[PDB]
Symmetry: C3
Subunit: 341 residues, 3 copies
């Protein structure tokens, strides 16, 4: 027992929600204990019911958000149940050494491993499976990616000496999928990940996804699963993309404070319309809602947003502010005396 | 009449030019009145005369640049003449609430609407049509996008307490187009936007444009339509892309001051070679010309620049500075005594 | 002889290595003399032995890194030997005027030219061939690109008044290639660049590379050609991409200090996981190695990294730090008493 710190077990929750944590803490460093269980399974990824052979951490795309503080140690038990068919591992972009931990975590079905990494770098970071060679992109675009947030012990700040505090946090994992089609253009189904591989790799090589989804499927965060907020709340939106660039935008809002490269040692940018998540990274945006109603959260390649699945909704309760925006005149016939050339 | 401010009607001009405005102002907030008239029409988009079924604000791709100051109110009359075939609306990324105004501006052919939004956020911002669902990307990549600039009341600054003033301003709207081809590879023509839709959507889904153009067509800002400047002038170049990333570069120049995310509350970066406009945003670059001659302004995917249409020219008058650059020896035969291995 | 400064001849070296230079200097400005010889040749670009008709500066993809200091003059002799088939030129993004020098350097086979440019802007910058029209992207994606670094005379700094010094420097040139395929999907071979052009241009137009390589071929910087370092060394990694965006990531490390837009007048960002090189630019990252072993340096589109060629290796000598990372428990059977749902 060389490392003599208190230990705290964390129970992960499914995205887009985040496990209970403190923003600012006066506790000293701890060993924060997390468990991730690999689950290979067929999953529905669009509104027409298209399936595909997914590979996940903890049964979700993305994998769950892990939250710790600068100077904590993160002790992760990775489990690969014997019902799975492939070896798996984990690479933390937050970690230092051994390919992020991938070189110390390769486990066959039936095995588990325990990795500890010190959280020396603040920000939001990707974690993903990376077995080796061509298996790396395949496992990641099959769903094996998530994120970790390493908060400063004093919480977030605006880079100019003022504390920032969120009222709510959501984790939006964006996934690019490469689903094979038959000669007629219909999506193909397979009985195992291994059976899907060869055809999937051919799609992957052309670098054009068939689907781009939030929380694992088209429409996952719309309708009854819209994200809730209230006028006045400061909401932190963490966005990850393990393989491909994204350009987040909150339709009808802004990013008040945006860390687009995702690292809290850098001052955020202010008042952004659209920001940029480079493939292989996580970023974060804070916004204080000023108006009630529906907001669409998109990647602002609108073809991807509307036609390949990458739209979420916020439903925001409160009172409308006519000073910020108003309909002066409702739709009406163009007046006869008008000249509109 | 709740809002008791002076009203000023603005007459928009066609890009790449910009309507008359003040950089710094000591006037108080005003209600700035703008009129935008939707025009569906066939347009020529390349040097071989390829046509396509465009949808525009005010008859241009991009739509005109609107310029106001922080704290002004922007009252926009959107008109959809009965000669048009589709409903249209407008979403201002500069605005707060109702999907940027899209949820308050949906108008059928024969109708108009009046929206007012308060200009609370400084920078350059996209505006675009967004009717709903798959119509959103289709209307935007058919040409229904422009930009608005919200200046600080004191004008631009370098983020370090020094005023910046431009001598000239140009607005470069970049448009990604998705023109269907027949089995031989020739571009297809249609008699209406509705007829073009199904084939266009198939091209859109593969996320590879057929054309990437400035000011609505290949070659629009070359030859007799090159952009004018003079040695010593500080020129502000506003660049928008409503759907797809761009990487602007001034060949033979630099960006002296660049707001690549486009928001004046953030200090600009200095001395850039190439900058990055994320899809769904506008950015701005200031450059003081130091040499006369032709400059090419490109997106620095050179395939897009040279082969898909995305090159503009500046023609700059003045005297050559041999200290910054000189041809020491003109092209000449390689000397016989040379060894060139 | 108007310009009366000392002259220093520099001998370029092949990437990823860099010619001898000083970081900080107290010498005054000099005329720094460089020679670049165009070489058209067939080159191997992947591990299956695929060839293609390359065009290079000095026989390498990328062309060599040139290093000077702010206020130096750079006098470049460009040579186009009579064994070559095409005209060539050079455009320095570091330079001011005449399309970066391209308008003053067009040379036929059998000719040479001498251009001088003043190094007024600090940072890392692309240089590339740009003959005119469609020849510009073709020459660049055929291999005719490199970089120049213009250091501040006091060396690098952290933008907050502290000097930064590297122990080692590597130049990673990333190249997107567009190799034609036959009806069966096999890569086509040609006897000259001219013969390859028409088919190559068709691939280029679809904006999807067949290969994305570091130092001119898949696997170039892996195995016996891995990049060396030691625990404790501060290594500067210069990364260029003349045509297409890249997202560099050091697997198992970070960017301690990153200039992603590549210009030293801007403070670096700290503690990045992944950074972004916009097409048509160079950037630079400093990292101090903390752990020994193998590191993969990738573009973090992992399909490009693993399947299209864009992976380099570092081999780092030193002692493992179990405080930063440790394998708490090696792979072992999942305990019988476990519940893993
Ligand atoms: O800010 C640059 C800095 O990163 C350093 C901090 O000094 O270290 C980072 O990783 C180290 C891992 O132990 C920690 O010192 C530090 O707390 C963390 O941000 C250096 O390697 C370098 O100056
Ligand atoms: O996309 C090509 C082509 O395939 C068809 C079926 O023949 O539809 C498929 O592709 C669509 C777009 O991805 C999906 O909407 C659908 O689930 C799928 O069957 C054609 O409709 C289409 O043109
Ligand atoms: O700088 C962050 C800031 O944005 C705020 C300003 O306090 O508001 C922005 O939008 C508001 C709309 O009324 C205005 O207060 C402000 O002038 C504008 O930049 C907050 O919501 C937040 O601190
Ligand atoms: O691009 C495919 C193929 O189509 C042809 C006509 O058969 O040319 C078309 O496509 C060209 C590239 O976009 C355009 O230059 C032209 O206007 C269009 O007819 C072939 O020439 C080409 O290989
Ligand atoms: O920082 C903005 C600045 O760039 C300027 C410097 O004053 O010039 C750059 O290019 C000039 C070329 O002579 C040099 O003055 C300078 O050393 C270099 O960074 C201006 O044109 C402008 O303020
Ligand atoms: O990529 C299409 C198709 O072509 C084949 C040969 O028929 O392989 C070629 O393409 C591969 C992927 O780029 C390369 O690995 C190889 O060098 C090349 O011959 C098929 O194997 C493949 O499905
Ligand atoms: O140690 N107190 O939270
Ligand atoms: O399946 N993912 O939320
Ligand atoms: O572990 N790879 O299939
Ligand atoms: O109020 N004067 O410009
Ligand atoms: O048609 N647009 O300039
Ligand atoms: O309004 N949409 O076609
Ligand atoms: O002038 N001395 O290095
Ligand atoms: O061939 N290039 O290193
Ligand atoms: O110089 N162009 O082939
Ligand atoms: Cu895996
Ligand atoms: Cu990774
Ligand atoms: Cu419209
Ligand atoms: Cu938008
Ligand atoms: Cu050339
Ligand atoms: Cu260039």
């Amino acid at each position: 027992d060389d490392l003599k710190l208190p230990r705290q077990r964390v129970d992960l929750v499914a995205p887009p929600f985040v496990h209970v944590h403190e923003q600012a803490t006066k506790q000293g460093p701890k060993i924060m204990e997390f468990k991730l269980v690999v689950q290979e399974k067929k999953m529905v990824i669009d509104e027409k019911g298209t399936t595909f052979q997914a590979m996940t951490f903890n049964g979700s795309m993305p994998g769950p958000l892990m939250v710790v503080h600068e100077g904590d140690y993160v002790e992760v038990t990775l489990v690969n149940p014997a019902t799975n068919t492939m070896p798996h591992n984990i690479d933390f972009h937050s970690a230092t050494g051994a390919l992020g931990g991938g070189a110390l975590t390769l486990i066959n079905p039936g095995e588990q491993v325990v990795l500890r990494w010190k959280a020396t770098r603040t920000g939001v970071f990707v974690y993903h499976c990376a077995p080796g060679g061509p298996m790396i992109p395949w496992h990641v675009v099959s769903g094996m990616n998530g994120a970790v947030m390493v908060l400063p012990r004093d919480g977030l700040n605006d880079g100019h000496g003022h504390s920032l505090r969120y009222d709510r946090i959501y984790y939006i994992g964006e996934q690019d999928l490469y689903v094979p089609r038959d000669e007629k253009g219909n999506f193909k189904s397979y009985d195992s990940p291994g059976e899907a591989y060869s055809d999937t790799e051919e799609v992957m090589r052309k670098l054009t996804p068939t689907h781009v989804v939030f929380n694992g499927k088209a429409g996952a965060l719309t309708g009854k699963n819209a994200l809730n907020a209230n006028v006045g709340e400061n909401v932190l939106i963490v966005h990850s993309q393990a393989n491909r660039d994204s350009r987040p935008h909150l339709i009808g809002g802004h990013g008040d404070y945006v860390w687009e490269t995702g690292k809290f040692s850098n001052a955020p940018e202010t008042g952004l319309e659209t920001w940029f998540i480079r493939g292989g990274s996580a970023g974060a945006a804070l916004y204080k809602f000023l108006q009630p109603g529906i907001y669409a959260y998109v990647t602002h390649n609108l073809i991807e947003a509307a036609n390949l699945g990458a739209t979420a909704h916020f439903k925001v309760e409160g009172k409308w502010n006519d000073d910020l925006m108003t309909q002066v005149k409702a739709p009406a016939d163009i007046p006869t005396g008008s000249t509109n050339e």
